[PDB]
Automatic annotation (TrEMBL), chain E:
Inactive precursor that is cleaved at two sites by a furin-like protease to give rise to the mature F1 and F2 fusion glycoproteins. It is found in: Host Golgi apparatus membrane; Host cell membrane; Virion membrane. This is Fusion glycoprotein F0. The chain holds residues 189 to 292 of 574 of the full protein. Belongs to the paramyxoviruses fusion glycoprotein family. Homotrimer. Heterodimer with fusion protein F2; disulfide-linked. Interacts with host NCL; this interaction plays a role in viral entry into the host cell. As a heterodimer with F2, interacts with host heparan sulfate. As a heterodimer with F2, interacts with host IGF1R; this interaction activates PRKCZ/PKCzeta that recruits NCL/nucleolin from the host nucleus to the plasma membrane. Part of a complex composed of F1, F2 and G glycoproteins. As a heterodimer with F2, interacts with host RHOA; this interaction facilitates virus-induced syncytium formation.
Length: 78, 209, 217, 311, 104, 78, 52
């Protein structure tokens, strides 16, 4: 497998026996999540289960709107 | 979305080239058009996907072409096993819609064609049959004659499939009438058109055995 | 090799629910979303819906929303469809299908054997048999008329024969009374009309029963 | 294209058939938990993109689970060798991938996952470790020093050598080396001649010069290089025997067999215990050949020929 | 050596005594939540090692909680001065630590 | 919008047309979470709901004490 | 869409905009290699001219 040689003249060492895996290109894939367009959160419900559902739906709505607000800024790394 | 096929039935001799058309109401997205072959009484077999790409194991005699509204399936030379039904499906939009289908049938030489009952009358209603046999050109049995008069809505036709080694066979026509009409008349004549023959055959139907 | 095995043929009265099964062999349910298609006899195929087990999701076309329910069972590697509020236009052959590659999108590669569903109007009910009479006179053809089908096209053999001697697979078309009826023709040189007896089999309706009829002018 | 989550189906089908006749109170704590489980992945994806301005790396499991990534690898238009390599090293594949958020419209949230393509596979690679090579004088500032500057990873590629100077961007899985060519320099095969003869004329070896003699160590794959200078106490130690070697001034090497610890001054190094064979190649230190009076001692990015020209 | 989580005991003792006579339907929403709480730490550890190729730094609280780390410090073979220093500066101790995944 | 010029003489390029947003100062805001001082976890309850509440309250107590132990080390970045 | 230099492949940015090539003689042609200071790590045009 792996072997190593030390050169005293130049104070250096070389470790041989490795195999390559070089990133030479890029493959791009599109990952999608299907979303639901909801507007009517109307519910005259005081049940705690109803309140939990309302909280989780608000979280979903906030996530979607936050992603949209991110989308109004085009992607760029620097 | 509508995707209609043409023609309804294709009559071609074995070894000839078959061309089946499938048109669409609107442009099919990404040319996502598929062709299936279906034998009598079994599941369809996928022939073409993407309107031009043939599936795995399909003989190269099947090919697809076309774009937008109009697509075509071509069989370069028909094998005996190729005389089955063919469907076109679009999957470039939702919902996915199929076509009505096209029948490919063996073309051959023109044809070779080879009273009321008691118990039934006793049992009330009666049914007079006008039967035929080995014949090719799809037109068998036309009109009835109850005392020199034509009728409609009281007769039913029912045909068979093409034969295996003669590509023929024929249709059955049953005229249904209640006991009040079977015994009211004494003749049940029939006129056939284009049986590959000369005159309508066996039109004598005297009431009685 | 991925394949689909469906359930047996079903006959159901109108307004009830039918549930058809489809078991996958050679592949995982999560690897093969299952599409449900149907075709009425004589008509073309009709896309009903589909199920994606790996997402735990399902969909139906607009014509089947509220009546079609698609479910999956992963431990038995099976997919079930259930159609409700049946109508005469819901008797058809039902297929479950899949695809072997993502390039097909919705070009269906592998198919089930199919399942016949008969929207009935009655139950197991026997036929009626009636012979023919001398009509006019080369050869001569005579038949044995049958009526009032129901429990699916049927086959029964007793005192019957070997290969050839004609073919007998006649249509068995329906009537306005909700009761099918077929014919049959046996043809022979006319001379044997004077000496040979014509004993014809007739289909009987349940499955295990028979009618025979001798034709004497 | 992958659809990894269908919140539209789960919210419109299950949930939202609550008959809101002022009540809406159709609920089961199961579907509350189930909705939390389904919605959590969207929340985590939104969290990650919020703190990374829409571009993330490595691709997290929320962005792409292992089963989805393995399925993606299986259907990629690549060789079965490349599919096998990516599947066996999923963690490295994640580390060399980006997730870019594209669009959210038409009830669709879409982001692109940009996966690596390993077009060069199973070619031989080697790693070069370098340490300063000074003269062994005890006094301070009275030394001339030289150091090879070409340390890093080298791999054969298309008849050339792809050289990765920043070896920290290369990930090693046992005997395999994963490297990005965007962080590489393409060199002729004669660059390996600097390892057999640093004075060869076919390739101009890269060195740097200095007058600062400072003691340090370099831990290699199968051993340790020790550069001991001045009055620094450099030792090689064993966990069951203690100090088993005291290095003299200069550059020395010790293999990992029988040695578990190298101490240079107040710095203690653990050597790698990887199995392999080591070879000591004797030779006179090249710094002995240089006259200090005419020695260019501040050549930061230089070469053997350039130093010879200045002399 | 520390045993920080016993999923074997929680799955075999509590849970999995469901009499699977075609039913298996022995359940209480409490033990569903409790199993989620116990299983979550394993999921978070698996997540972290998946994105860091089996080596992480700093050692997260999922990898070692404060109580476990303080107990570990208390039993380390070091001076009471060093124990006091590490305990008072746990956040720095985490920052100067590695978590290497060995074996399953 | 964005324009670019390449100078062959100096082997350099300049991309013009961008707009600035430079961080020139710092604004500091105080974010608070109101906490509850609890000591009596006394409960002779074996109900599973009670055990879950006890676990979540212990988590809260551990978080508060851990933050206090962090506070015994004054903030500093280096 | 792609520039390859040796064994390194680069994807260029597809941003919309106008580019301009400004022709000129490379300034490295003006320097005599014999008296050229070739290890100036942090230098300037005037400093190099002074050393020459």
């Amino acid at each position: 497998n792996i072997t190593e040689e030390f050169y005293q003249s130049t104070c250096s060492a070389v470790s041989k026996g490795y195999l390559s895996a070089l990133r030479t290109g890029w493959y791009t894939s599109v990952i999608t999540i299907e979303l639901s367009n909801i507007k009517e959160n109307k519910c005259n419900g005081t049940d705690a289960k109803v309140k939990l559902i309302k909280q989780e739906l608000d979280k979903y709505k906030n996530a979607v709107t936050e992603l949209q607000l991110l989308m109004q800024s085009t992607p760029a790394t620097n | 979305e509508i995707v209609t096929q043409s023609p309804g039935t294709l009559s071609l001799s074995p070894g000839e080239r078959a061309t089946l058309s499938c048109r669409a109401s609107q442009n099919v997205g990404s040319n996502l058009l598929a062709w299936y072959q279906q034998k009598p009484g079994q599941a369809p077999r996928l022939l073409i996907y993407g309107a031009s790409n043939r599936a795995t194991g399909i003989p190269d005699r099947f090919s697809g072409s076309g774009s937008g509204t109009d697509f075509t399936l071509t069989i370069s030379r028909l094998e005996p096993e190729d005389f089955v039904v063919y469907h076109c499906q679009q999957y470039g939009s939702s919902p996915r819609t199929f076509g009505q289908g096209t029948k490919v049938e063996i073309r051959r030489t023109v044809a070779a064609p080879s009273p009321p009952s008691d118990e039934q009358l006793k049992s009330g209603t009666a049914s007079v049959v006008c039967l035929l046999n080995n014949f090719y050109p799809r037109e068998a049995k036309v009109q009835w004659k109850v005392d020199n008069a034509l009728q409609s809505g009281n007769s039913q036709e029912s045909v068979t499939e093409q034969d295996s080694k003669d590509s023929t066979y024929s249709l059955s026509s049953t005229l249904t009438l209640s006991k009040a009409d079977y015994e009211k008349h004494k003749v049940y004549a029939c006129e056939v058109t284009h049986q590959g023959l000369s005159s309508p055959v066996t039109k004598s139907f005297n009431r009685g055995e | 090799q991925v394949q689909l095995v469906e359930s047996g043929a079903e006959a159901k009265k109108p307004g009830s629910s039918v549930k058809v099964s489809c078991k996958i062999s050679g592949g995982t349910l999560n690897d093969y979303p299952i599409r449900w298609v149907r075709q009425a006899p004589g008509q073309g195929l009709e896309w009903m819906g589909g199920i994606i087990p790996i997402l735990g999701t399902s969909y139906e076309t607009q014509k089947f929303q509220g009546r079609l329910t698609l479910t999956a069972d992963e431990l038995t590697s099976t997919v079930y469809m259930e159609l409700r509020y049946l109508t005469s236009e819901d008797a058809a052959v039902y297929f479950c299908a899949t695809m072997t590659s993502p390039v097909f999108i919705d070009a269906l590669d592998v198919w089930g054997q199919g399942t016949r569903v008969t929207v009935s109007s009655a139950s197991t009910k026997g036929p009626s048999v009636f012979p023919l009479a001398p009509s006019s006179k080369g050869t001569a053809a005579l038949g044995c008329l049958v009526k009032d089908y129901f429990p699916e096209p049927v086959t029964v053999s007793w005192n019957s024969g070997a290969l050839t001697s004609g073919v007998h697979t006649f249509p068995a078309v329906l009537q306005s009374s909700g009761l099918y009826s077929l014919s049959s023709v046996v043809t022979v040189p006319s001379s044997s009309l004077g000496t040979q007896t014509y004993i014809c089999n007739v289909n009987h309706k349940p499955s295990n029963t028979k009618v025979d009829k001798r034709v004497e002018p | 294209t992958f659809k990894v989550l269908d919140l539209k189906n789960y919210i419109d089908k299950q949930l939202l058939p609550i008959l809101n006749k002022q009540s809406c109170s159709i609920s089961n704590i199961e579907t509350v938990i189930e909705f939390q489980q389904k919605n959590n992945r969207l929340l985590e994806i939104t969290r990650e993109f919020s703190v990374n301005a829409g571009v993330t790396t490595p691709v997290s499991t929320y962005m792409l689970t292992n089963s989805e990534l393995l399925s993606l690898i299986n259907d990629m238009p690549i060789t079965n060798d490349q599919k096998k390599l990516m599947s066996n090293n999923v963690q490295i594949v994640r580390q060399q991938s980006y997730s870019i958020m594209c669009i959210i419209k038409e009830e669709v949230l879409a982001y692109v996952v940009q996966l690596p393509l390993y077009g060069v596979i199973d070619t031989p690679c080697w790693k070069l470790h370098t340490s300063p090579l000074c003269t062994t004088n005890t006094k301070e500032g009275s030394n001339i020093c030289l150091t090879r500057t070409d340390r890093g990873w080298y791999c054969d590629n298309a008849g050339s050598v792809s050289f990765f100077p920043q070896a920290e961007t290369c990930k090693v899985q046992s005997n395999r080396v994963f490297c990005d060519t965007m962080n590489s320099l393409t060199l002729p095969s004669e660059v390996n001649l600097c390892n057999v003869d640093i004075f060869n004329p076919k390739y101009d070896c890269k060195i740097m010069t200095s007058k600062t003699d400072v003691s340090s160590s370099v831990i290699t794959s199968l051993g340790a290089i020790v550069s001991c200078y001045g009055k620094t106490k450099c030792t090689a130690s064993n966990k069951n025997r203690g100090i088993i070697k005291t290095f003299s001034n200069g550059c020395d090497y010790v293999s990992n067999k029988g040695v578990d610890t190298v101490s240079v001054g107040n710095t203690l190094y653990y050597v790698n215990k990887q199995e392999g064979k080591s070879l000591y190649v004797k030779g006179e230190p090249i710094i002995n050949f240089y006259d200090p009076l005419v020695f260019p001692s501040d050549e930061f990015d230089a070469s053997i020929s350039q130093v010879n020209e200045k002399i």
